[PDB]
Design a protein around this ligand. Structure first.
Ligand code: EMC
Ligand code: EMC
Ligand code: EMC
Ligand code: EMC
Ligand code: EMC
Ligand code: EMC
Ligand code: EMC
Ligand code: EMC
Ligand code: EMC
Ligand code: EMC
Ligand code: NA
Ligand code: NA
Ligand code: NA
Ligand code: NA
Ligand code: NA
Ligand code: NA
Ligand code: NA
Ligand code: NA
Lengths: 410, 410, 412, 412
């Protein structure tokens, strides 16, 4: 994976409702980024456009794989450079009334390597005073995207308002991010007070470079952005920033500096996990079985998994729907688990419970945990018995037949 | 509770190992704070002293209620002013080798209204390079203290390094804090890069005033502090700061400004709780029973409680140790609970499990949850059956007799 | 004179065309300042009002002068506090279109203690896309006003745009200022970029506190201000700043601190007076006196003087108008003068020449300086002879001399 | 001349007394700059070394000049890049204790393009508790060095402490600078408070990019530097800054941007030249020419000139040494001159007077100016007569005049 020094360029622009003009601006900077042999170029949120009306910023929503986007993918190839499209107006075939705010990272091939959907939207609705609903022009993302590996390092993905919620960034760092990102279209009055401080703060708390390509100037009579597109190092210093205008800045991030800081200031090893736990709901994929004590549970027997736990079908179902929920960390007692695990184990149990009832169509479930010899534990590895109930109350090939049905319901 | 405008003074000093000199400096500023009719004065971490050796910063550790401290309590009375003693070297009768870093808030009567023990310590130990262990000169605090009500508003308590962990502050705001605090003795090189940014960041993310009284200058040949004691408003502006020297600054915080901002920018109503949850382990006191569906469980029947859940002794114990764990929020199904609740419910179940086994001296427990008619739920309110096991397997006056024994073990 | 600690209050506001609303905003803050026993409060630049157009600002100037000006003097007296009125629209009796932008300092008794007229105005005339003319709603000052002594120290005076010019502030510091002031109404876009840096820079490079009450928010549909009213110390630290709204902030200034810095960082003792000189046109006021060699020139005979020079009538003039320009420092050679003194001495000669030619109605003048025994110098003190000339051309009573001096004095 | 965008690199380092280590640090960065095709790199103030004592700094100055100076010129040529050596210990052949602090600009061919000697040194002598004397390890410059043209623009030159003095920077901007430079080694405690604000302020008030490579970290047990090497744009934005360590940062500067700002914010067209004047002693270099009324004074006869004035020998001198001082702008009256011109004209007269008296060995001088027909003025162009005087006292060949001018020219 990425290591050492890497040269990158951050783009600042003032997008119109004139998609061609907007494109030309960007293309011009990307070309210059290539000329300087940058490995990656970052563009701001709303890089595609910023319409006058909303029947406009919903009518122009693209497909991520459209003819406009191809112009970008074509550029990435042409200049052998990765791209960070800060926040595309992602049209949703089903709900055209609510596009997505998608941050895309593209290959030197033009191949999308990652997509992140703005998770936090601004919704203010004060009875008879003011009503500004971002959730009216767009739609929030539904899941947590982990950082992506790039030639310049582990890049955490976020967008604008996201910067305001520390939990999201702490998580990305925990998932091994080296650089955080916050392409944005900040307000002049908000940005002039919170932009630099919030970005520098994120970089310092997570000890990561922060790359924030932004919108600046007036997009139209009723909209102006703060600008100040910058790059912050893992120590909180602003090592690169654009001048007040449509232009770019350059930075040479050094992944080694990140390592040095994390080593000399092990903050993430100082967190009192015995007092607080930042739980995140993440859905991971198991391209290989998992250890249930000494036994090996086949990936085809697992229908849901997260970085802390997994759910697998039983070899001796005490009743239809009877599955198991155990922590990836091989541990026998519940009292041996850490809050992160305890919390994730039962929140997963909750997600699984609801699904088993929608399927086996019932309205009752029993959660049992045999922790100890005297309690009936037949295997030294914590497992939650989740068994749906009704009125009454194994084929290795048929066990994966069950696991498949559930996997599509999780 | 506190409302409106309130005038406060922040003290900056460079403490010696000369407790009398240090005292005089502080007393002088407190007197001036009184003269200006301030309602509260904040002093920095290590306000009592900063010794040359460690056999010194462990020998001088006080009692919180000693003759030195009385000088302060006497001052609070004399000038009718609340005090924030940023970080006293709190001697522990049992472990004299590890004092506490205690932030105290004192009455206009000299009455302690709150104590907070530094939760985060700096411990760096790189094999053959450098070894700086804060946990060698002192001892971390063991529990989470909630904000205290003061005449100037809901004051969240923290100390120095704490500022580096966002979770702690998000929690304090959630517990209704209006002002956060971070009295400190920051390093010149660290502070010159992270002080203002981290404080301004906390104020902005939690929309609270931030009061940080600090140490400055050189305490001795081998120790210098950053200083820059300040006050930040809920918008991130530094409204007051001390000059580079032993002196104070004044600020008039306006709790209404806090309300305005929180209303016009409802960030804490934008957090995706469906994706992440900041769980905190807090121990609350129930000076009154709780609703277990429609029934009323007596406080004397409850041995442990938190802002999300409670544990009470059963009216029909299926076996010794058989207790119940339910969420304060009256809900029937597990799938009706929020991650905060799910997580806290079972982490409490974990804490309770371990205690029941240390007492009933056994090594097995069963966790059951009858969620639904068909599962055997006899009451429409989620409750976890926690029943310790062995080989074999109600007096209202004797039920509180059990609850009392456990309460002292929780 | 003032020394020690002093408590002050800085006010921020959003002035519009509602004199009563602006006044009530200012009054509220002055009252709170008085309640906290502040010795002085600072109001921002257009504290009186910001009109929607030229004609309205003319009407408002009259309505302000007529009703509110005195109301502030009353507040000053009632709350026993000094006021710094950051820059009112001072209506000019003979030019209603161009009032001055006056910074007024009012004492505890409501008495004007000093008046600064904004010297720097922003004039942008781009035939193509722009025309922003501040001199179309105003008129720049005419004199350099030295710092005023106040209960909080030597206060230098200026108004926003003045910050961009270092010359102005360096001067005030040299003239004894311990605090500089920059009451103002900055544009949101320009303030958002230069406000803090400039105010802090002036503080640091001049080693003075900087007090800058400012306008903030939306005044009208097409006028916005940055805000961020603050107080910066002599080391450049922002010790107090208003929150984003119509409100105030408090700061205790310490003149001791200024002194301490001036001593551990004697920056002003390090200037290369030999390479560069900052000359300033300043007319001095004097009880009298002044030596010319061992001679005592009575004030009656001195009609113009600056911190560096003085001009006086001649007992034995070689011709009508023959006056003398001399440095206050008593030295004989022109080569004894410092660049600062040489610049002033001849720039003053330039002013006297013009004054004399207009008065005596001549069009020629001879400037002569005899430096040395062999050049005919009669007294060991540099003096420039300024001789008006006529086509004819080549002991006087005290009464004649005093009169001639009175005449010239009122033409300078 | 240079226009458009230009890529540059700024270097930060922790120089000590190990010339080889410091050089390898600098070399590494210059190579990386070359690899990125930068047109110019900036090294900090004491890039050569920081010694543990007076004697070591003298030894190191020799060892530097002997081996490393040329090595940098080689790097310049090899990597086809221009160098800005922030302030080497320039050993003075006749005073080993007081070298100059020279800022050198080396071009692509390793040729010195310009040399600035630090004009401002920090001297603190408090009989009581302190004695910090920079002039004890150095010697201040002697001349004002105007900006140098480079592939990246008009570069003004300075070294750290110079930032505190606005005069120096205002001048460079007036002399055409598009970028100001402040290579340096700031104290950790002073930089931590004034570094960013001052650099940014100079940028804003002069509308120039500011390039400041700096020392950082611990040099030795009792010497620390702030660091934070950066590049500020004409609007005051910090566009590039090194991380906390021995490393570099990159910035693309745009001369177009400077221009644009200079036009939408014509700050320098707004200065009150009528109230204050910033005079600077500068000796001009000239191909020749210069008119005196309708007369063409050949360079052969001009022995001293500044941006505002020139002095020349006389065809019909009334006495040995009779020369003339005149403003370059052709105007007849002394009252036609601007304060800037009046200050310069007589400060130059002051210098010529001294030069002539020492040369002709006299002790008296008569300075005379005839302004107007009736004052005897013969040509309609201001000219000051400078007449050396003797006890005796009161057409010349081109050869005599040219010679006399050569003599005087080498004494100014
Ligand atoms: C909704 C993408 Hg700007
Ligand atoms: C709509 C927040 Hg960039
Ligand atoms: C351990 C209190 Hg400074
Ligand atoms: C020891 C951290 Hg203030
Ligand atoms: C022109 C006075 Hg605000
Ligand atoms: C003096 C009454 Hg307008
Ligand atoms: C001329 C800006 Hg208040
Ligand atoms: C005195 C040159 Hg660093
Ligand atoms: C020029 C050899 Hg030291
Ligand atoms: C004289 C400070 Hg580099
Ligand atoms: Na499209
Ligand atoms: Na004690
Ligand atoms: Na000033
Ligand atoms: Na102060
Ligand atoms: Na004469
Ligand atoms: Na300069
Ligand atoms: Na630029
Ligand atoms: Na003559």
């Amino acid at each position: 994976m990425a290591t050492g020094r890497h040269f990158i360029a951050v783009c600042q622009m003032t997008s119109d409702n004139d998609l061609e003009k907007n494109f030309q601006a960007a293309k011009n900077m990307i070309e210059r980024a290539g000329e300087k042999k940058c490995e990656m170029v970052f563009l701001p949120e709303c890089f595609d456009f910023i319409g006058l009306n909303k029947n406009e910023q919903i009518d122009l929503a693209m497909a991520t794989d459209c003819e406009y986007m191809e112009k970008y993918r074509e550029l990435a190839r042409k200049h052998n450079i990765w791209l960070s499209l800060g926040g595309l107006h992602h049209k949703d075939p089903s709900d055209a009334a609510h596009p997505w705010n998608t941050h895309l990272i593209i290959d030197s091939d033009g191949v999308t390597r990652a997509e992140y959907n703005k998770l936090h939207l601004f919704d203010l609705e004060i009875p008879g005073k003011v009503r500004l609903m971002e959730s009216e022009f767009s739609k929030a993302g539904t899941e947590m995207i982990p950082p992506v590996d790039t030639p310049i390092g582990r890049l955490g993905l976020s967008i604008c308002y996201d910067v305001r919620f520390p939990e999201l960034s702490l998580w990305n760092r925990k998932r091994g991010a080296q650089l955080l990102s916050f392409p944005s279209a900040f307000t002049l009055n908000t940005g002039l007070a919170h932009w630099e401080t919030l970005l520098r703060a994120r970089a310092i708390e997570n000890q990561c470079y922060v790359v924030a390509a932004a919108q600046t100037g007036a997009h139209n009579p009723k909209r102006q952005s703060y600008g100040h597109s910058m790059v912050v190092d893992p120590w909180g210093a602003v090592v690169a920033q654009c001048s007040e205008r449509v232009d770019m800045c350059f930075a040479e991030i050094d992944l080694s500096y990140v390592d040095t800081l994390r080593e000399m200031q092990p903050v993430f090893s100082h967190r009192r996990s015995d007092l607080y736990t930042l739980h995140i709901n993440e859905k991971s994929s198991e391209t290989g079985g998992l250890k249930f004590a000494r036994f090996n549970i086949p990936a085809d027997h697992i229908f849901y998994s997260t970085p802390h736990s997994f759910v697998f079908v039983n070899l001796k179902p005490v009743t239809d729907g009877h599955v198991l929920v155990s922590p990836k960390r091989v541990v026998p007692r519940l009292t041996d688990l850490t809050d992160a695990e305890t919390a994730d184990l039962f929140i997963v149990a909750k997600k699984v419970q609801a699904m088993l009832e929608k399927h086996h169509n019932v309205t009752s479930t029993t959660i049992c945990v045999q922790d100890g010899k005297d309690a009936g534990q037949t295997v030294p590895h914590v497992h939650i018995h989740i068994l749906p109930r009704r009125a009454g109350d194994r084929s290795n090939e048929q066990m994966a037949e069950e696991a498949v049905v559930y996997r599509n319901l999780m």
